[PDB]
Symmetry: D2
Subunit: 371 residues, 4 copies
């Protein structure tokens, strides 16, 4: 036995309980007693290796992306999904130079645009991507997708009104048409869309990601809405950036009982370890704790739920035996901490989640001397 | 002191004396040794021995762009051992291009850094591709300056293609950045808003006027059909002129008119892309473009010079490559001049039937035999 | 779109040539007005050639070559690396060589932790350590399972000189075979100067395993004391044991090969044992085309040479139908070769020469539907 | 201004004082704001150090078994620049450079190991084996080709000179030292369990050469028969021979360290011998900050510990003024630490333990002008 974690509280997302037991690690697998290394996790909660489902981590190919193996592991994140940073032109290089050598397990959505989001970033000198259906290379998209079905979960398209404010057709209608023909899912930046929520939501199906559901910049999900709630119960999964979160939509929607199925960060160089809006995934989870979301439901939105969407159920996002030894050891801390949205509205919280140790593929990649 | 490779019985091309030398070349390691007996002996009987050719305008950011090729795959078997990427990458994707292509590659690649954020990553799929954004409103100077300063051992300057409602002029803004950051420029300058008489006034010694024989819009010829005075004056000062025979950057009428008036390119290159590599009758390879110029009345030792010594100078590598002299890097291309009817095409469709073509039979790169026909 | 016109297809199954045109769309062959037309008049149109024992972990080993550079011009588009990498460096080999390369590369994982990284630079190189006491069974198992799509088994080099003197714990062959059996995989073994006789040796091999350097003729060959192929060697080939004539610089003997082919024993795989020392350099190995041309001038039928570098290894690489064939929907890996007439000498390990009269000369190479080598006139 | 760190305390290594001051970062450089941003870091009650420098780490991950990725495990504990102590040799250096050094955020210099494969054979448990240091296998043409084509990164040659390694044709130290001198560079030597004595072995060291594991006490230590530091050792530090304590799991003796410091011999450089086995794990090595804390609790002044991990290593990497300093126009490599009071155990090779009452804890890390680690509450 290579590592043992003793004296901790395991969060059992299945039953909403805290289990008093040790974790066993041999190789890169959690197993079911002497151990070469013993971790003392007293007062800590043992979580599965966290999964940030909407990030941008094609560093070197874009200006906005960060290296997840450098900034995410120390805050408990061991797996990520890239939200269409790459397109068919640069996906293979993204896979060969980032995904394959990274320790953070990275999945991805292929962007409709061929170069992805490489044009945004670097400040205001950056420019928006070209979402014109006239420049969709369907032959290359299908080729990239079919040769990489084990890493690309779907197609990513950003549908903000400003990206197209004179195209041949509507970028959504054309994308969703491609997605259906290619038998795959879609993920849509919906902030400031040309259509209203009651109209866009008719284009989504079981497995598709309606991202930044709580944005409220333009047509929000509030008049809440009944077609969105129907789509959520049909199988449509529902990313705080610097502009894609509004407290008024979030407080209202959750007051009415609507909850996001996935919590993400839209992690960028601009909002990594730096704002009161994103900072880290833990910071984003901590806001939902102080916004009334139940703890075991926050944990589900960053472990079990995305790990099924990445088609990795039982492999990650769980502390079961035979799972990858991806463990995040956190302590819930009581301190005054402020959360901000797009409009500048603040919320003063009483607690935040602080990561004290990270184990990735059975290796101690992060461990404070004293938790 | 035991030699590693000897190429014997070949005709060595001395570009400086414009003559051939009948002697053997010695190689120990990755260096050329003076043989004024080895592990491996190559018989260049009936062959001309060139230094490793240098393609000065190719696009070789494979993986990061849609138009590039891999030089290690398609360029070594046709004699080319060094290359310069003409702005495939911008400040966003350069360091990836240098880490994932340049550093692992064998073909020595120097580069020009495009001013656009993403370089030329945006064109390529065919009709679905689209042109790059040269808006000076999107020039990240602090990023361009950071990329240039941290990689002055590789970036020779900035590339711009000069052919929406921008803020400034791309060429004026770029030359301003180029001059401010104290480096050189390279301009596509095909279908330009200004006549060649005006545009050339901003070029300096070591700058690159690319696609000089393009003949699509304002060419290097006046309405009388003669090479502009300032164009000739520019080359006298030190401005470099490069043909880069693309699929739409070469016209027969302009090229034929310039060389009869005594205007010969300083650089012969290809604008090599996956579309024009080993495929067309316009930019088939560097040897195909060189062969086009032999069949055009360009002296042999001038065509070689335009792909060996002139580029090796502009990449700040005099004596290291582009030559077969002692202590040079062992980049050797062994060729035969073969006689056969071969047709060259231009952007307009005009055709020229030629008599011969250059044919590579062997390539030594960094002292290693990377291409060697069994019988030359 | 590429169409290759006026060519001759080799049919390894029906052992005849066929005048037909090959069609390319995307990266796959289709069943036949194209963007690019290639005049292959007076040419044999082969599948992309497959070199089964090469050493291609460049950057990590001193002996390896970059297959994208030196192999594609000679018709080879797929290769298998005969154990240059061990469990220590396989992932680096896969990420820095295999994934970005254009030549499709499967591999055998060396049983030694670091592989053959110590075996180059000339005489200063030294033999790898095949002591079973230094096998990391857990790391070998881990590397195999997390990469079962690219690793076809374990590679062992089993010369007397490797273990001679160095007092190893157990016998490397018995240990590596035991591990290969326990791990439900296959083995590939350098057999040159093996301690055991071929009749004894071959009793450890099973269907799908590789007997590398079958014509090595240094020590215990596949010939008995009267010059005949052992009946056990012959029975093993029938069971499924794949015999491979890896033409090293010291792994081929004309007297053993000629005898074996006189008695009807033909190697199932023709390969090079390609290293930076024997690539484009010698008279023993030079290219895959060179080694095949030796067997052509040695009496082996052409359609059986072609199969031993196409259909057979593609099956062992578990890629049947995608490569090693020109059938529709296979990957567009195409080699255009010409049968050239010229005096050519082939040398073996001891210096025995054979003056042949023909060799195969590659003229154009298609890889993943892309022209990557094309003589302007061939 | 991009980043300013308010309310901290720089540590002046020259004047041996602490100054409450602010740090300004623009782009990737520390700017001078001494006479008056986009992000403000509250460093209340923290010591503002430069990015720490670990001088003997093993970070050729992928190509070795003992190496860690410094980008993952070293940045969050304050390290932004490292030197690899001969994990790679001439065979695998360029792959080490292209696949780790070039793409890494941590700035990694290196020493080339005289062994061809470096330390790739080490680790993975007891199944690993010692590298081959026989001078008969030194490839001097390749070592010289590698160094001279990579002199901006290779600071010298590394040899591990223990008896258990060579227990050969010539003495590896004598041969290595000679090669170093002929090649005109510096050397670095694991001086643990060596054949020669400390006074005898030090006579081969010039200025800029590293005497690794100076406090090892395993076999021949820097202490004579009377428990006193050798005069020739003391004379060498005067000349400019750098003594690095490293540490690791077997190269640190508490008796030797305590004696040699009681007589005024303090190590010029403090490092870890960081490996996959001693990273974040033992009570011996754990991190640089853990090792520095052991030296803090051992009676070493704070400015000397900080110097031995800031200025002194940055000098031997030929990078004075770019890293290891907070001066204006240095690389924006900042470490923000607190000196926590707590009961912490320190262990040495032989098991001897020393209980301390403090240790350094890293709360934020800035690398090349980017926040790569920042606790929400320091
Ligand atoms: Zn996004
Ligand atoms: Zn161009
Ligand atoms: Zn072999
Ligand atoms: Zn060490």
């Amino acid at each position: 036995l290579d590592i043992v974690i003793k004296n901790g509280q395991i969060a059992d997302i299945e039953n909403r309980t805290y289990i008093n037991a040790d974790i066993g690690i041999k190789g890169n697998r959690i197993v079911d007693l002497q151990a070469e290394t013993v971790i003392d996790a007293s007062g800590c909660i043992i979580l599965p290796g966290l999964i940030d489902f909407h990030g941008h981590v094609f560093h070197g190919g874009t200006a906005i992306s960060v290296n997840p193996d450098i900034v995410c592991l120390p805050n408990g994140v061991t797996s990520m999904v890239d939200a269409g940073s790459s397109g068919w032109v640069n996906y293979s290089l993204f896979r060969n130079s980032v995904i394959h050598p990274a320790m953070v397990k990275i999945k991805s959505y292929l962007n409709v645009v061929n170069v992805g989001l490489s044009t945004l970033g670097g400040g205001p000198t950056g420019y928006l991507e070209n979402t014109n259906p006239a420049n969709y290379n369907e032959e290359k998209i299908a080729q990239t997708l079919n040769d990489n079905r084990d890493n690309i979960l779907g197609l990513k398209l950003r549908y903000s009104q400003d990206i197209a404010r004179q195209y041949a057709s509507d970028p959504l209608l054309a994308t969703v048409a491609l997605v259906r023909k290619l038998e795959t899912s879609i993920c849509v930046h919906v902030t400031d869309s040309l259509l209203c929520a009651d109209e866009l939501i008719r284009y989504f199906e079981e497995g598709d990601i309606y991202a930044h559901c709580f944005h409220g910049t333009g047509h929000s999900i509030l008049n809440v809405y009944a077609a969105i709630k129907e789509a959520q119960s049909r199988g449509v999964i529902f990313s705080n950036g610097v502009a894609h979160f509004d407290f008024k939509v979030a407080q209202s929607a959750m007051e009415q009982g609507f909850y996001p199925d996935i919590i993400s960060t839209d992690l960028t160089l601009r909002n990594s370890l730096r704002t009161d809006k994103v900072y880290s995934l833990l910071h984003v989870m901590s806001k939902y704790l102080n916004m009334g979301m139940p703890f075991f439901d926050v944990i589900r939105a960053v472990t079990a739920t995305p790990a099924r969407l990445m088609k990795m159920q039982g492999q990650i996002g769980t502390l079961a035996a035979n799972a990858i030894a991806d463990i995040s050891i956190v302590k819930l801390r009581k301190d005054k901490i402020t959360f901000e949205d797009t409009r500048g509205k603040t919320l003063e919280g009483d607690c935040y989640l602080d990561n004290c140790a990270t184990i990735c593929n059975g290796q101690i990649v992060y461990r404070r001397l004293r938790f």
